[PDB]
Design a protein around this ligand. Sequence first.
Ligand code: GDU
Ligand SMILES: *[C@@H]1O[C@H](CO)[C@@H](O[C@@H]2O[C@H](CO)[C@@H](O)[C@H](O)[C@H]2NC(C)=O)[C@H](O)[C@H]1NC(C)=O
Ligand code: NAG
Ligand code: NAG
Ligand code: AKG
Ligand code: FE2
Ligand code: MN
Lengths: 568, 706, 19
Amino acid sequence: LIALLARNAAHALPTTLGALERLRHPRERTALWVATDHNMDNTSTVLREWLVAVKSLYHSVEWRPAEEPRSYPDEEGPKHWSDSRYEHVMKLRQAALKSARDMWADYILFVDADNLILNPDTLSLLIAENKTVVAPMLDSRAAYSNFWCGMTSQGYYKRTPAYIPIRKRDRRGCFAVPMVHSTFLIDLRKAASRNLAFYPPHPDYTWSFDDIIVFAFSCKQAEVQMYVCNKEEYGFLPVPLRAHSTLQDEAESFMHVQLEVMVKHPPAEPSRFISAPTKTPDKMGFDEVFMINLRRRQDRRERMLRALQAQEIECRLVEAVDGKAMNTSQVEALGIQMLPGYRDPYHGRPLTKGELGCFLSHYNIWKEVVDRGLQKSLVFEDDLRFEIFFKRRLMNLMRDVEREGLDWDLIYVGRKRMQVEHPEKAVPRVRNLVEADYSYWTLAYVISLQGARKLLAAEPLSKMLPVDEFLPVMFDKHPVSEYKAHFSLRNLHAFSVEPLLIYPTHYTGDDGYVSDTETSVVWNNEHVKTDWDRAKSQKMREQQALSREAKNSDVLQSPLDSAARDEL
Amino acid sequence: PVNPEKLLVITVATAETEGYLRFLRSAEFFNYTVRTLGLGEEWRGGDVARTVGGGQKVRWLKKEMEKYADREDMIIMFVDSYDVILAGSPTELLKKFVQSGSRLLFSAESFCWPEWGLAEQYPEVGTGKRFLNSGGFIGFATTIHQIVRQWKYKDDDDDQLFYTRLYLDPGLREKLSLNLDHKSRIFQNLNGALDEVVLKFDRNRVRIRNVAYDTLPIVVHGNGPTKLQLNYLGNYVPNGWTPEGGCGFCNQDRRTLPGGQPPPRVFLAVFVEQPTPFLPRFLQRLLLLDYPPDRVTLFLHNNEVFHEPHIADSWPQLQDHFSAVKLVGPEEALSPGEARDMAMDLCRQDPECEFYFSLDADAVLTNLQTLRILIEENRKVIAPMLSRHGKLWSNFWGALSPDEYYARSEDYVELVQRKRVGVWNVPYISQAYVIRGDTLRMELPQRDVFSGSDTDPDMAFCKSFRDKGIFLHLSNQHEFGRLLATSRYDTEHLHPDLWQIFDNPVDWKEQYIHENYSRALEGEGIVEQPCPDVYWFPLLSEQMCDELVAEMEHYGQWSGGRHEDSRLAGGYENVPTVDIHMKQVGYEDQWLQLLRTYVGPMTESLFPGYHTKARAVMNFVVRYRPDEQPSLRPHHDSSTFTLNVALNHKGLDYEGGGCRFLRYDCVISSPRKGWALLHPGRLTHYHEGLPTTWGTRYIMVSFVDP
Amino acid sequence: AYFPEERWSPESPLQAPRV
Ligand SMILES: O=c1ccn([C@@H]2O[C@H](COP(=O)(O)OP(=O)(O)O[C@H]3O[C@H](CO)[C@H](O)[C@H](O)[C@H]3O)[C@@H](O)[C@H]2O)c(=O)[nH]1
Ligand SMILES: *[C@@H]1O[C@H](CO)[C@@H](O[C@@H]2O[C@H](CO)[C@@H](O)[C@H](O)[C@H]2NC(C)=O)[C@H](O)[C@H]1NC(C)=O
Ligand SMILES: *[C@@H]1O[C@H](CO)[C@@H](O)[C@H](O)[C@H]1NC(C)=O
Ligand SMILES: *[C@@H]1O[C@H](CO)[C@@H](O)[C@H](O)[C@H]1NC(C)=O
Ligand SMILES: O=C(O)CCC(=O)C(=O)O
Ligand SMILES: [Fe+2]
Ligand SMILES: [Mn+2]
């Protein structure tokens, strides 16, 4: 008896319903219990459309609408848990359980609004395991998940060191725990399961008055223990927000979870009976947006556009020249000469051709933005993972920067802070913004107009080096002074955002890693193919290496980038 | 599959305290073979684990190892045996050792105890504990002989650093294969890992489980400053309490009081260090404890002057009853600690008081067989489990916070409500105990146990017992009584016990409400119907009536008698009487509580289908005397029904009559001392009372449900 | 507030089939 409970579910109902339609279970042995109310948006219309479209294949559907009123009296907003809301949720779930005992039905599987049950075999794999209250462990973007590991005195989170070796899947099989909320799967044939009770608290109740601390007590009193097990990948859910945000915030968060699905799977298709309200892409308030891509590489680009309209961002695509395929006859036609006395800083090899092509593409982009005279443009690459609230945060930060006004030229949004040391100076009166440093991985950066003009004034047509090494020279931060002496002027002022907003999708020595650069032939000759480096990759991740007294706490952080609840 | 007979556990324990007995039982449950060392000689080392000492044990071990220095087929095990409980089976231990493959396995703890400088010279392990701790090792006999032969030092020098220095040598380590249980697969330490241990219950045994690496240890070793947590763990592992098997070693070591000789002596000691309610009842109850009164001595130290009259009253019966008596007055200005110290000292010097059973006066002992059971349980210290009424307060503490103040444990709520039964182990008991005599003579020989600190006597007492290595049991098998709440006590009245219906309801009911009330409520007769639709049932007892009328007379101002009124809002009485409203005495809310609790059910069971709230406005005491005013004219009452209670005997103190019911020509001849009268008083009972001729009579009235 | 348990709870018998 699949028992939904929806409210303000308009942003996410299509995807979750599409992934709940395909559960591998003979659809003549199922039911529904959709029961929604108190919703601003048009959840009623979409849910009615779907349910009327599907009321035939299933066994016996139900419904309970209460469209009026449209808000609770003693509430702050859409995301505040006033005690009336707790009471209503408890009563409604209790009524669902009572309705699933008079139909003589085994099991009752409590999906909720946003819990995207991806894997089709969830129900079969939970059923074939024979435990009284079991609840698969859905992933997330952060530590949050749907099972605790210990309650202290009044039922609040106490982390026990047997958490991380579960949430990271270092152990498998079902593990007795004292808490599962959201998506679980009761049983209703076993004898002891006639004392589970949602609303009327057990007479010995002493703790607070939540809606998931009134269940755990009931299941502890009747001698049934709540399992959770994670033998495979099951679903995804978004982290709860604070009690003071708006509905658009929730829509954006679920969009982020949908985006997270695409890193290692095909996207989560919407259902067929209801349709998605296509949104209008916007130009971010910018002049241009660019994206380097390779014609031969076809998989990456499709995912990247999917991500881009997923955040209603248009894209001006450009083609990257194949450095590998290019030969000396046209290589020297542009006067392309490698910078004298340059090698690989980590290996010693002189240079490669994939870097040559990337440098040429960036050079052409710079020339085009100079020729057309754009004030500010954005650059991307072919392997990304967008962080939460990307568009809104970038917009607010750049609005602040422009309103204040300063010599911002090569503002960064994603890099690797290799110079792990005491924190860096913060630019005054600007939030989330710190001064630049030595860093590779020019994944994404906003090139300005004056910065572009200065960089083209450099004339790096006699000096080829990787851009992640070229950029730090121009604003006087390269450790090696010979490269600085080989250049003349250092008038660039690079900046960066301390809550980094773009990370590489695949790290070195990991799955799905095919580097277009690095593993190619030398700029000269055609018989030195440097293989992809497994042992001395040396670019694993600057996240476990940064877990030291890096601080940077003197910065001023946004009212956004604060979320989460009892879990982290 | 090494043979389970080639294993020989070697411990060391000079004396035989209780912890050693606990270890012996735990090891015997699995049929190990323990061979002790140094049983009888003197501890020639130093402090146990304060800073230093204990180099002597390695000397005993070396002296013993010459016997097995040639054997090759035997695996030996050395565990310090004062604070260790074995949690598992021999075959599993041998299998885990063999799977480890090495020749000498040490126990790994997270701190370099004696010295700090050599922290870095140890190997590097990413996850588990790193350093070494010489608390317990298992290995082949030959390697242990080779490893212990090199001891030549003073008998006082420290032990663990010698093992540390030896193990730190690389060549020696590779030659003899010394390894540390980095991941805690066999040895588990309760210092620095006190957040990774969960009790994994089972069908008929218990077992611990280290979550962070998911292993099941074998030797829990509560080293360092964590003997309290080991004491708590000692109730369960490995057979102490099994979810189906009642208790474990919880019904043995019973004397059963044989011989025929009169049972062993006692030195009772009742302390009254507070103004406590219901004192005379407790004093009278002291005369009923099931023990021949030719042995039980007594010692009754008051400390409050207000309680002088009751003890002065009840002294002679106690003087007759018990084989000896002694008091200490309030004028000695003795501090409570000094008094408890004096009692303990007086039993220490006498070579005859085989026990000592203190008992504070804030402890009502419902069961009359407590002393027999406590004497029978045969342990060094033990208490009964007195619990406050309908709450969680009681006389013990689950666990000690680092401040040495109460910190709740994980099974205190499941002990208070008797969901588990046995004789537990606990780090603080109070308000009743049975201290054995020998423990008072040759195991705690100092004098100042209670006093000698700024701390209150109870906590200092329990600390001074914990430190010496003596367990503080607590037995909660049967029902042993209830505590009394003396937090607030207004003593500025004639009989302060009357205002005690909001703090100690049960004893209030046992003392004041008539003794036959429950029988009448249940419906086995007694309730009488002299005339149609009138009821005659027992409510109050002699004590309550006497004390209430005495208080009322002590008030004195018998106002009333005027047809016009100042007490009534309207100010016009339909029929004045010489009365005092309860609102004047302060006895209003208490009487309302009495009506709400002890009267409502009676009517709801006598007039079926009626639901009452026992709300009242008018309630008073009236005095009938042949001089001032005679009885009342026929009338009616502005209530659904009225409650009429007599307050003194008929004939012995007044000659008169009861009430007469006009419409039935009904007469009520003799009111009894404590009963009550119930009748509708709105329409159908035009009632009028006969007058009185001799003496005086008082009656109770209350117009319930206006 | 230490030493949390893992209480022993078995699997209760099945309820008799409907008719
Ligand atoms: O009138 C209501 C109120 C709530 N809900 C449902 O309650 C859930 C709450 O929505 P979220 O997805 O935002 O959940 P939260 O992030 O707020 O987190 C919640 O996660 C569990 C939801 O079951 C806990 O019960 C607890 O209420 C709370 O932490 C959704 O199923 C929502 O549809 C309703 O259906 N109707
Ligand atoms: C699921 O677990 C239940 C738990 O009881 C199993 O029930 C047992 O079934 C066997 C089969 O004959 C009986 O012999 C046992 O007596 C049952 N257990 C009890 C406690 O009575 C059930 O078999 C399990 N499911 C499957 C498919 O095996
Ligand atoms: C312990 O018991 C087992 C069987 O229960 C027996 O074989 C063994 O000999 C006993 N131990 C000793 C030391 O005899
Ligand atoms: C209570 O009733 C019993 C019934 O026989 C009687 O023996 C006893 O004396 C009564 N108690 C009194 C009058 O206090
Ligand atoms: O005194 C009164 O006001 C009424 C007394 C009464 O009803 C009675 O005593 O029967
Ligand atoms: Fe009356
Ligand atoms: Mn959610």
